[model samples]
Target: MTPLGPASSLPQSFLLKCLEQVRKIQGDGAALQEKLCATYKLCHPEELVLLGHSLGIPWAPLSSCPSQALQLAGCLSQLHSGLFLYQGLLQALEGISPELGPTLDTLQLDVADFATTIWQQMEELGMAPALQPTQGAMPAFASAFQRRAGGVLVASHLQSFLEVSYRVLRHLAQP
Candidate 1:
């Protein structure tokens, strides 16, 4: 029999809109770098040493592509949501101990490793090809080119990130 509930839910359109707003706040390509750096600083504060170290690698290269920054930010947000869900699940368990703490810590490390591995693979793909030159005063055309490049970069990274996340979660759920 199949499970009955609200079913898996995620407002993808709303999430995309949120990411678009973030990109706008980031302004041009250069501003994307600064924004990503700020995000890294916020998420990896000094007090969170292990998290900081785990996130350092992927966070460092985020500025290389605007799409990457946006996709990674989205992934991080999803991760935060999942952590909250995990906390709730733990609460339902009959018994828990300090030993489980180490397991949780290791799981956290696995999540970070998955994220960094995807980032590294995406970076290896390098930047998207440049758009061809257009004739006349078509600023809109150039703008479209930039948007397309950004979208492609973000989409590629997002796919890899999601795939790794799925695999890791599936493995963790098994005995």
Candidate 2:
């Protein structure tokens, strides 16, 4: 209850801002995926389940969302790491970026900043990890088409990743 009160004082605006920012980035990510899919006729990440497994775009399992297991600070860290993963994936696409190069780059930068804000907040609360997780190994794409498809999958996965984080934040926002 000690920490929870401190968290309770955590303004509703923090959570609301988190939800809004994540969705904004996710929406832009989806649009980028869509653009690549439509223009290059790349397989929608939704449709290529096995391909995703092979490529290892890495859908993270953030377990801090459950009521029984919730830790708001840990949840925040996990959410940022998940975002950071996709951010790295997008960064990896530098060599194979599609016609939407500028747009894609901008989204990556925006996503990175969003994660940083959450991280700094967590640190201010003395809840941030002493050492953030590394970006980890991402798959190599043999072609521009693969890179584009990777973008679609990573972005879609990011949106899904955001769902539980947003849910936790929304719950915290309530009285």
Candidate 3:
């Protein structure tokens, strides 16, 4: 049989280096988010609401917690920043190829639609506390929470990044 050409040869070292770089980048991004959230108590104000949502914490009658509003905002802000990074990375990758760019954009739009639906529903449900004060307040609505709306917006951004990352990996593997 004929010898495999240079193009057909697998550069294991190069591939490993690329993977290592990607892993490092992702790790750094996650660390940054964690640091920011911890430093700012990203969800400090909404502790009660979030706790209620997670652990079924009960809200007393006629109990108004303004901190809930602030917490919701913080959560959304965190989510938004994450999504924005995802989108930005996707954009950067897509910039390498016109064909991949449109595909990534389409996926991003779909993610956006999902986030929009969540937001619209949240808006329809007013921010005011619901009755049955003994019952726990509604869960922190990232989309509904004014401060957290950014999180919803960034959902689309992440979709784009996933799509582009897949395409790039596939392209690199081609013979």
Candidate 4:
């Protein structure tokens, strides 16, 4: 039988947790970005294209995250993979700065938690693949300078990716 009334298939508690985590991560990311700007003069990710290219910092793709034409299963998969990517990127950036260390640590933990949440959702929906997405070859940062540069790029892109994910998830939250 077809269901009726408001029809909110996604649990509000799940959505609320996700929203809270997203905002938490975004706030930490902004602080890291500002620290990079102030300490390293790495204000904009756009200016780090050459440095990023040299460090091979990969972009976290979110092709399925569009709010207008969202693909639930694909978005979940991408979100998991993207968060996992940031986990690796942040791992490689350990000790990039004393000022940013705690923030990076907390942010990475939140990202991993969010990744778990998406993956568990996929499993519940029977959309999870046979195996978890394996970690790909992570970009290597040769020097502290490279790690800092990569951090700027990675944090900037991560914020944008989360912004889109928040929008799409909010859309799903609506009845």
Candidate 5:
């Protein structure tokens, strides 16, 4: 079995760096939400759940992220896939605003790089699926309101996912 503890030679520092980036991205996601609320009064995803459903805003699930009975293979797969999903979502969020544009652009790039690192690590462990993961069906936004609402939803969900990721990484980082 490919134990995250000791089987692979993947660096603990890489995981440490990933934890740092995850926290950084989570902060940016939170900032994006703050701007959305200030600029558009779209405060929370729960208020937009019905709209989220109507607009086909997809949720990036980390079914393998839970610490209980954690499986390294599935956990890494979900992590990579989740990052890819958010990368696509962030692309869709372009032109969301001139004020927030830089944050979104840099945020998207960080996610892309982070996903690449995970993909490489998975490959090193011989756990990656054949061929790199591709983009899935990203949600479409026909209006600025729709895009902002989708952003709020995406950012909220992403923060939650990264929280679990942080926990998982912290556990794996233990000596």
Candidate 6:
């Protein structure tokens, strides 16, 4: 069953438009990462397993997402915060490679801008939550290995998380 938390709170068309934004961001984010991995000659993400664990490379699960019956206000909050976290991580990736700049810059720009619209739409609907996310704990990649591994893993997992989110948005936007 598709859970639409407070389904009627948002205009279907508004939600649909943002859902479209989500898809574009998700695609561009993945494609950029793939390009980085290929161009950088980075190893498989598993190659840096111990370092990733030591560096606190956490996973953003959608367990509390609206699809799981969590409230859309919080679900949207979680989604945006993860994207917020992602943008920061990519921000850290700057200077990782001269060739990598455009890919990182473009994807981060898309995420931040898309996040802006959802945030505005949520506030418009008066659904903004109390415990908003602000400069939360984000991982730091101190080494080229870690950044490259992070680029591979973070990008992949973020897409998986957003895929579920994309589904939830589509369901909520349904007529």
lDDT scores for all predictions?
0.36, 0.60, 0.41, 0.64, 0.63, 0.62
Q: How many residue pairs of model 6 clash at the backbone? A: 0
Clashes of each: 0, 0, 3, 0, 0, 0
Residue 96 of model 5 has an lDDT of 45
Error of 5 at 160 (Å): 2.3
Q: Tens digits of per-residue lDDT for model 1 on 1-175?
A: 8775464554456756854643443233224333443442332223443332343212222222233336644454444433322222223221222232243344334345544654464475523322233642212212233332332233233334434544454343232
After TM-score superposition, the amount by which residue 160's alpha carbon in candidate 4 deviates from its true location, in angstroms, is 1.8
Worst ten in a row by lDDT for model 1 = 56-65
The positional error of residue 97 in candidate 5, measured at the CA in angstroms, is: 6.9
TM-score of each: 0.22, 0.61, 0.29, 0.65, 0.65, 0.63
Candidate 2 residue-wise lDDT, 1-175, digit = tens: 3444555555666667867876777677667666665675554435765566577545667544566356666766666555556566666665563445577667667666876886677677635543334674443455465555666566556556656555665665243
Number of the candidate with higher TM-score, 3 or 4: 4
RMSD to the true structure for each prediction, in A, is: 20.7, 6.5, 17.8, 5.7, 6.6, 7.7
* lDDT digits (tens) for residues 1-175 of candidate 4: 8666575554577768867877776876777667765575446536676777677544556545655456666656666566667676777666444554466666777777876877678677635542343574454455476676666676666667767767666666354
Arranged by lDDT, best first: 4, 5, 6, 2, 3, 1
Candidate 3 stretches greater than 4 Å from native: 1-5, 41-145, 152-175
True-structure lDDT of candidate 6: 0.62
| Residue 105 accuracy (lDDT) in model 4 | 68
The digit string of per-residue lDDT tens for model 3 on 1-175 reads 8985677455677877866765555444445434543453353433334433344222222211223345654444433443433444334333433231243465445445635644564575423322344564332332223323233222222333444543454455444
- Which candidate number would show the highest lDDT if scored against the true structure? 4
Off by over 4 Å in 6: 1-25, 41-50, 62-68, 95-101, 121-140
Q: Predict model 4's lDDT versus the native.
A: 0.64
For model 4, how many clashes?
0
